[PDB]
Amino acid sequence: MSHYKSNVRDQVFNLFEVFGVDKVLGADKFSDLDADTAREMLTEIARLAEGPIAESFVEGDRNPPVFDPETHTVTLPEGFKKSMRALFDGGWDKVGLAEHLGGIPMPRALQWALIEHILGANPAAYMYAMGPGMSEIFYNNGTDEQKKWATIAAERGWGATMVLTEPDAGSDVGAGRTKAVQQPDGTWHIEGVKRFITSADSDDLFENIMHLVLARPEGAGPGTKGLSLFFVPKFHFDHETGEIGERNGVFVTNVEHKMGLKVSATCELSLGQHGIPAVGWLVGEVHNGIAQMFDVIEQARMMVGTKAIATLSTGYLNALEYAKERVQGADMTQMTDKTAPRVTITHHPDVRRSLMTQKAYAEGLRAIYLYTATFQDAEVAQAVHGVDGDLAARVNDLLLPIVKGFGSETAYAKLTESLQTLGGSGFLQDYPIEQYIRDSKIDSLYAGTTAIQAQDFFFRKIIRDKGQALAYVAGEIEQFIKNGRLKTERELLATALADVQGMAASLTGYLMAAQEDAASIYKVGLGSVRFLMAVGDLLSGWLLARQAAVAIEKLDAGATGADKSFYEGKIAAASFFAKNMLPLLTSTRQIIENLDNDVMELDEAAF
């Protein structure tokens, strides 16, 4: 069929058998959505993804968008716009939208499971379809008058952008210099150049685009605290009827040539530089821009991590299908007999090692983002964890940089194994793995680099949090550890939990010691990404072991056939991950415990 190989079975196993999300289906906010309907929804969008969405995956990469300087617009390849129309015609751009904007109320964990299929099949398609979701964010932060415009924007399916980055302001958002000048009538004129804006033009997919633009009001203070957020539409419109009016002064000037994700137009965006003003409306009519924009960034970060995990999953399943059919070499137990029967390559230990590595990380990462999503609804977190609203928000905030940072880094790294499994054929564009790699490289960069994820995780999600979310998660792991067929895995998990706790203590010591010895803080920076990755590995190992515990229960109860095979794979993956990935965390702890500032004191000229 298509390049995209989906895994609804594993999503349903997580949602229902592991986390118990079906417990809230049929109750309260989700009163009208039952478990059967949720499963039909996943199967339906999986088929959409495997069909018309994936159909244009190759085309978007081989025949990428073209910038037109004669009109300051972008043209998209026809096959990809056909895929977009399939997404829209099915109403999938209203996934998880609030009911009053036309959505179907559902748990976030189900919402992200639906979205995984789009991100695996053609992830730029989800990015162009995020308009109604961003209109909901504008609604939540807007005045009563602005909530009327957001409703129009959602109902009409306008596109949307998030507009922060400038040539000199990427990780350091607060350095932005785009300016906002209030006009007598209460609107603002926005002036500046922004860079790397995803979907800044989208051909004729939509009748309008809502740009949500960070800019600094004249006279405002420095840094991110001096930023405000502005609603800046591509076209002016009638605030009552929605009728599209005159062009607004916000124009793309270039489209970047990228390693991958080529069909996502990534644009320099000029505001008020082409002779008409870029009129913006202060969101909520309050000056609170970085806090408002982080509502969007949080979702972008969830999407980026889920995208990376979706891509690893279809990479693994492509590699697995290939390995099952590729005949090459003799069985290793017959390697000295040059007339021995040839075997398929799944018989080779290094290939089974590779495949189980891909499998355990893909499925561990899926469990992680679905686990994370179970904290994004108060009702779900109460129902399935017994955790109240405040703690749930802090745990979600803790896990987001794991989904994003650990997800992006891990998926790209393990796709290397997926390609390797194809041999020389993995290097061909004939197979989709090399495009998976190119498309996923950006996931460690956009929505905040890995280093920024790791700094967020430690300084904000742990230290500022006074460790409360982290202690909750460590307690659940400890509970699992304390509890026969999983005794070895629980012992390996106990070592890994202790290692992560040791890392956290060492970095906390380096931070606290910076009050008297300022350079001590550098050791936190030196260790931060490795710590983030260690926590990701610990969470993967724990959730895999929890899956294997469920699988043991189901096999004991008499699972047969394809179910039995699935459950056997969960036990194998949990055991392989505990025995081959978790122990490296001990060496990483000892490395972190011995970090020093030699590398910081070295003259720059010595590099």
Ligand X SMILES: Cc1cc2nc3c(=O)[nH]c(=O)nc-3n(C[C@H](O)[C@H](O)[C@H](O)COP(=O)(O)OP(=O)(O)OC[C@H]3O[C@@H](n4cnc5c(N)ncnc54)[C@H](O)[C@@H]3O)c2cc1C
Ligand Y SMILES: CCCCCCCCCCCCCCCCCCCCCC(=O)SCCNC(=O)CCNC(=O)[C@H](O)C(C)(C)COP(=O)(O)OP(=O)(O)OC[C@H]1O[C@@H](n2cnc3c(N)ncnc32)[C@H](O)[C@@H]1OP(=O)(O)O
Instruction: Output the smallest distance, CB 386 to ligand X, in A.
Output: 37
Torsion (CA) 507, 509, 514, 515 in degrees, nearest 10: 140
Residue 591 interacting entry, from ligand X, ligand Y, its own copies, none, C-beta within 5 to 8 Å by type:
its own copies
Residue 197 interacting entry, from ligand Y, its own copies, ligand X, none, C-beta within 5 to 8 Å by type:
ligand X
Place of tokens 């992560």: 500
Shortest Cβ contact with ligand X: which residue? 170
Nearer to ligand Y, 216 or 490 (CB): 216
Nearer to ligand Y, 359 or 394 (CB): 394
Place of tokens 């999300």: 21
Instruction: Output the smallest distance, CB 540 to ligand Y, in A.
Output: 22
Regarding 118 and contact with ligand Y (CB under 6 A), the answer is no
Contact 121, 49 (CB under 8 A): yes
Fill in the DSSP letter of residue 458: I
288-303: string of b/e by CB count within 10 Å (b at 16+)? ebbebbebbbbbbbbb
Regarding 222 and contact with its own copies (CB under 8 A), the answer is yes
Instruction: Output the smallest distance, CB 556 to ligand X, in A.
Output: 35
Regarding 460 and contact with ligand Y (CB under 6 A), the answer is yes
Backbone angles phi, psi at 228, to 5 degrees: -120, 160
Residue 290 interacting entry, from ligand Y, ligand X, its own copies, none, C-beta within 5 to 8 Å by type:
ligand Y
Instruction: Output the smallest distance, CB 294 to ligand Y, in A.
Output: 3
**For the chain, first and last CA: distance in Å?**
50
Nearer to ligand Y, 165 or 418 (CB): 165
Q: How far, in Å, CA of 506 to CA of 432, rounded? A: 42
Reference 547, options 519, 508, 576, 509; nearest CA is: 576
Residue 512 interacting entry, from ligand Y, ligand X, its own copies, none, C-beta within 5 to 8 Å by type:
none
Pattern 209-238, binding to ligand Y, x per CB under 6 A?
--------------xx--------------
Instruction: Output the smallest distance, CB 184 to ligand Y, in A.
Output: 30
Regarding 412 and contact with its own copies (CB under 8 A), the answer is yes
Instruction: Output the smallest distance, CB 357 to ligand X, in A.
Output: 12
DSSP 549-604: HHHHHHHHTT--HHHHHHHHHHHHHHHHHHHHTTTHHHHHHHHHHT--SHHHHS-G
Q: Residue numbers of the site for ligand X (CB under 6 A)?
A: 161-165, 170-171, 196-198, 258, 261, 266, 326, 328-329, 345, 348, 350-351, 420-421, 423-425, 427, 442, 445-449, 451-452
Torsion (CA) 399, 402, 405, 411 in degrees, nearest 10: -130
Instruction: Output the smallest distance, CB 265 to ligand Y, in A.
Output: 10
Instruction: Output the smallest distance, CB 120 to ligand Y, in A.
Output: 16
Nearer to ligand X, 198 or 376 (CB): 198
**Beta-carbon contacts of residue 573 (< 8 Å; ≥ 6 apart):** 356, 359, 360, 363, 364, 544, 547, 548
Mark residue 81 as left, alpha or beta (left: phi above 0; alpha: psi -120 to 50; beta: remaining).
alpha
Neighbour count for residue 377 (Cβ, 10 Å): 24
Q: How far, in Å, CA of 432 to CA of 438, rounded? A: 10
Alpha carbon 66 to its chain's center: 27
Instruction: Output the smallest distance, CB 569 to ligand X, in A.
Output: 20
Sign of CA dihedral 402, 434, 570, 501: negative
Nearer to ligand X, 39 or 301 (CB): 301
Regarding 370 and contact with ligand Y (CB under 6 A), the answer is no
Instruction: Tell which one of 15, 76, 109, 134 touches ligand Y (CB under 6 A).
Output: 134
Residue 586 interacting entry, from ligand Y, ligand X, its own copies, none, C-beta within 5 to 8 Å by type:
its own copies
Q: How far, in Å, CA of 375 to CA of 390, rounded? A: 10
Pairing of strands 209-217, 159-163: parallel
Residue 444 interacting entry, from its own copies, ligand X, ligand Y, none, C-beta within 5 to 8 Å by type:
its own copies
Regarding 290 and contact with ligand Y (CB under 6 A), the answer is yes
Place of tokens 């002036």: 191
Pattern 252-271, binding to its own copies, x per CB under 8 A?
----xxxxx-----------
Neighbour count for residue 464 (Cβ, 10 Å): 11
Regarding 164 and contact with ligand Y (CB under 6 A), the answer is yes
Nearer to ligand Y, 248 or 376 (CB): 376
| Interacting residues with ligand Y between 331 and 350 (CB under 6 A) | 338
Residue ranges binding ligand Y (CB under 6 A): 95-97, 108, 127, 130, 133-134, 136-137, 160-162, 164-165, 171, 173-174, 198-199, 223-224, 290-291, 294, 296-300, 303, 338, 376, 446-448, 452, 456, 460
